Design a protein around this ligand. Structure first.
Ligand SMILES: Nc1ncnc2c1ncn2[C@@H]1O[C@H](CO)[C@@H](O)[C@H]1O
Ligand SMILES: Nc1ncnc2c1ncn2[C@@H]1O[C@H](CO)[C@@H](O)[C@H]1O
Ligand SMILES: Cc1nc(CC(=O)O)c(C)s1
Ligand SMILES: Cc1nc(CC(=O)O)c(C)s1
Ligand SMILES: Cc1nc(CC(=O)O)c(C)s1
Ligand SMILES: Cc1nc(CC(=O)O)c(C)s1
Ligand SMILES: [K+]
Ligand SMILES: [K+]
Lengths: 330, 330
């Protein structure tokens, strides 16, 4: 028996969500479809220009942990919020989903991270993230017992932006592997890959990471190539298992020379793509830790991702376990 | 020319929204479909039992002012938040919709009001409201020039719960009527009517209120009758204009002996009824201040109400002006 199926580690963020037109992004020099880091002054400026908004707990890894719990797995999360109202909201939402979350706030400043997410008419999402209290996440926040007792510890490439989070992750990798567990990461965002390419490849090649999640753009960025076939060949050589999503084209799971192609689910309409990759990882890691085949892991990931893009908010409000049962996956 | 079409005054609240099953309401002794006042301790208890939630700016009059602005009218709002993150969210959302909102927080404590709103499968909403900083609203928060320059000042029956808000409303009524403006109120909630029946009837009969909004339950409660026809006859005798909504069954506008009936719009599915009455008031009051017939005012109210119940959140995220144009209400 192990206490946890999946521990995730990431930047603890509350999302501030609004729809905008295409010109808004141009006028405000926001890179479309990407995670744009911003300082406090820029956060105030952008907020002053944003329309009425909705708030929802976010954070890539936070969403993934929530998704695992939703499917019925046992999940835990490490991430740092402030002792403020946004932090209280973040804390409530992840615990309410049934995720173990015990990271202690350090104070009220910097305040809890928030990301202004602008959703264009095509359903694409452009994020503008003030890291706030996320910059304080470090080795002191590693619950060593939790890492030791988790089948998979999964973390964000996004953690390479704040200063000390990487130290916590290296500690996690040591503990996880000493206890025969698996380490996983997501490449997070293609510009994030542009920033930390070499460090990410070192994590994979040194065996600190066993299972890597990427989308098409991230895989291309990792090898600075426009040849997707090359990117797949190289990523398969650099890590034990790679799961590469291709939006409406589904996904491909790679292990050594093995490839398993999975279709995207049929959807009603793309409301908001926020969380698609996070929830693909939820479905995959849920399947993985339930001993399911790699193809079935991919199928579970595509199911969860397809569900989340049909709602506002990055964490499915409906039952993923019921959806999996209905789709004949569990 | 007048600076404002509609000034609204109410409890400034951020909503915390989650779906629940029918048994949840019974287990927690929450009165279904009603506004349940709660203290700080109960707020903590209920939050600890609530599932993952979404936050959205609320407050009945706040929603109404936002709706007027959305339709293209000129709106202002009085309501008191605290100097905290929820208050900043509230301030941002209403100002971003184009509503004049200049009520200054008095400090951080009590904190900004919030309402835990539980939405059952039928789309009904059951609210659990901690008033917080709303208890500080008083005559000092009346911007006399704004009241003087607003065609209609509209307020919540809900303002009779906090201690000094009624004094602000009596000041508003004096200024509005001295400047030849109209006063309006909503009965808010049938239990609120149970609490303040006599005071509400005195407001109407003394002519401090010119235009009254009610739903069926509130009208029945006002006269402690189960005879809806009696309630209509009585409410028509007690105020200059009464606008009475009957949920899915439309609305009736009363002026003296005149009655103008309106049909409800067509719904695919009722997602969440939160804000329906508020947005009925937005449509009606926008039409009224544009010099439209009482029937057309009712039509605009029903249009706005029908739109808001098809989304999560109490303030329409789509263009009400565009919908009104499409409907030939313009
Ligand atoms: N820098 C970041 N690190 C981790 N997650 C982020 C970052 N910026 C935005 N997000 C989250 O990405 C999610 C979508 O994958 C959103 O819910 C949002 O909170
Ligand atoms: N006591 C109250 N006073 C005014 N508005 C309230 C109260 N409780 C809940 N609400 C608001 O009622 C709205 C729905 O009519 C919600 O957006 C919610 O914020
Ligand atoms: C409470 C909040 N303040 C802001 C503005 C800021 O971060 O400066 C949000 C986007 S949410
Ligand atoms: C529409 C979708 N985008 C993704 C992530 C991606 O490939 O960018 C899914 C898993 S589904
Ligand atoms: C930030 C928040 N705290 C709570 C709990 C409380 O009010 O005590 C909410 C409903 S929202
Ligand atoms: C579902 C609806 N409720 C109302 C208000 C009510 O009658 O309770 C509308 C105008 S539409
Ligand atoms: K989404
Ligand atoms: K609604």
């Amino acid at each position: 028996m192990t206490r946890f199926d999946v521990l995730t580690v990431g930047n603890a963020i509350v999302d501030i969500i609004s729809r905008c037109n295409d010109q808004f992004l141009i006028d405000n020099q926001i890179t479309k479809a990407a995670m744009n880091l911003i300082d406090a002054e820029r956060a105030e400026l952008l907020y002053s220009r944003m329309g009425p908004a909705l708030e929802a707990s976010g954070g890539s890894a936070g969403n993934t942990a929530a998704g695992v719990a939703n499917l019925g797995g046992k999940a835990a999360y490490f991430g740092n919020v402030a002792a403020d109202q946004l932090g209280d909201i973040f804390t409530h939402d992840i615990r309410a989903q049934g995720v173990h979350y015990q990271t202690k706030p350090k104070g009220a400043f910097p305040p809890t991270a928030r990301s202004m997410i602008f959703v264009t008419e095509d359903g694409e999402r452009s994020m503008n993230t003030y890291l706030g209290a996320c910059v304080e996440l470090g080795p002191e926040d590693v619950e060593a017992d939790v890492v030791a007792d988790a089948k998979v510890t999964y973390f964000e490439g996004y953690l390479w932006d704040p200063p000390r989070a990487k130290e916590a992750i290296l500690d996690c990798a040591r503990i996880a592997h000493q206890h025969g567990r698996e380490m996983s990461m997501t490449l997070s965002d293609s510009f994030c890959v542009d920033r930390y390419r070499g460090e990410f490849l070192d994590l994979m090649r040194s065996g600190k990471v066993d299972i890597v999640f990427a989308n098409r753009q991230e895989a291309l960025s990792l090898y600075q190539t426009d040849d997707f076939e090359e990117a797949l060949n190289r990523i398969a050589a650099d890590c034990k298992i790679a799961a590469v999503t291709m939006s409406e084209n589904g996904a491909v799971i790679l292990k050594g020379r093995e490839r398993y192609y999975v279709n995207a689910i049929r959807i009603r309409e793309v409301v908001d793509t926020t969380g698609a990759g996070d929830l693909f990882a939820s479905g995959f890691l849920y399947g993985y830790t339930q001993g399911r085949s790699l193809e079935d892991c991919g199928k579970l990931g595509c199911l969860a991702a397809g569900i989340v893009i049909q709602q506002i908010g990055p964490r499915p409000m409906t039952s993923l376990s019921e959806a999996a049962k209905q789709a004949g996956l569990i």
